[PDB]
């Protein structure tokens, strides 16, 4: 009866940029979701939070990233915006839970934290759970770029530059999306 490494995902030291969101696979353990106040965003879809302790699933996916405050609303089924379109897209029939909490004391630096970035330019929207780490120059005109940033040729990613003086809407928030996969194998993740 081993326990699920949720401390490795939530209490992790460094989170990834939303364009290169991290995915931790979880199988063969017992999870206490009831253990999971400082969490200021806890929205579950297709399942109630309590009953999760009485359920078993084939696999669990913990996707972790960091965005800005006013963008957390995009981490939900059937949403639009730069994050939901070009960075991290949840499916319309999403059965899981989105958890998010403010990390201003952890990810904001005086002078800017430019490590966290988000994809700004992309010709088409992402499919659900698609992951794009391409840093190729974006072609907005009728002429090619060939790795040369310039007129109608832009770098597709943009840094947040989190600062402690930003408003809570522009402050860094850490987001973990728990997806529950019911495959055709005996359930490995269970509750107490």
């Amino acid at each position: 009866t081993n326990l699920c490494p949720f401390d490795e995902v939530f209490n992790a030291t460094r989170f990834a940029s939303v364009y290169a969101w991290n995915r931790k696979r979880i199988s063969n353990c017992v999870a206490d979701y009831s253990v999971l106040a400082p969490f200021f965003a806890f929205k579950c879809y297709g399942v109630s939070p309590t009953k999760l302790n009485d359920l078993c699933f084939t696999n669990v996916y913990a996707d972790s990233f960091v965005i800005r405050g006013n963008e957390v609303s995009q981490i939900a089924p059937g949403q639009t915006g730069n994050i939901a379109d070009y960075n991290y897209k949840l499916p319309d029939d999403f059965t899981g839970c989105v958890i998010a909490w403010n990390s201003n004391k952890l990810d904001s630096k005086v002078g800017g934290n430019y490590n966290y970035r988000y994809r700004l330019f992309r010709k088409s929207n992402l499919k659900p759970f698609e992951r794009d780490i391409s840093t190729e120059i974006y072609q907005a005109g009728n002429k090619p770029c060939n790795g040369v940033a310039g007129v109608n040729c832009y770098f597709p990613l943009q840094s947040y530059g989190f600062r402690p003086t930003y408003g809570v809407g522009h402050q860094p928030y850490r987001v973990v999306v728990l997806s529950f996969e019911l495959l055709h194998a005996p359930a490995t993740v269970c509750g107490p």
Partner: antibody
Amino acid sequence: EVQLVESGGGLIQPGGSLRLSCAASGITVTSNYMSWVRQAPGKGLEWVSVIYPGGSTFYADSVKGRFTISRDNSKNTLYLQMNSLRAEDTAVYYCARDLVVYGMDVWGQGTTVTVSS
Amino acid sequence: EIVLTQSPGTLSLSPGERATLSCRASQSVSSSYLAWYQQKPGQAPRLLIYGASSRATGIPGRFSGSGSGTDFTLTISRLEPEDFAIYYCQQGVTFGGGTKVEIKR
């Protein structure tokens, strides 16, 4: 040559419809944030609508349910369809390419829309 | 939403003087998204400054943007007769009220 040529504006009665067109040159409408921004007579600039490169559309509160932004890649033209036109919609409407981080650099010449009975 | 307020409403100066236009935001906004545009009567807006401080292509060195947080400023060092127009600051969807620079007499 990178520019935007607008057309389609004129006189409309309140409650009527009108479709403004913005033919692009040098830039691809479908791979860019494209914005419609209006300016009322003697007033300032007001953002009207935007369409993302991926197709997501967003509208100002004063035009929701009445305005629809769209585009055509075969003709490389942005479009703004206005229905249920009101007296407050009389303005010069511009189309512009929004680079978000690099400002709205390419603008049109604007087209006038007058709505009165 | 964020509210950008420009000051002063009207700037009365003479050609050759220094113009300083302020744009104050209701909340602290990343300086990467703020732009300064110029508009003359009967013309379309013209992008002057992008990313708070970066000049667009074809803008004289007398125009320069600076500031951050909730206070940004566009300064025209050597005012020329063609520079007397209205100026808007814009952050994403929001636009500032505008500032008219007029001939001082």
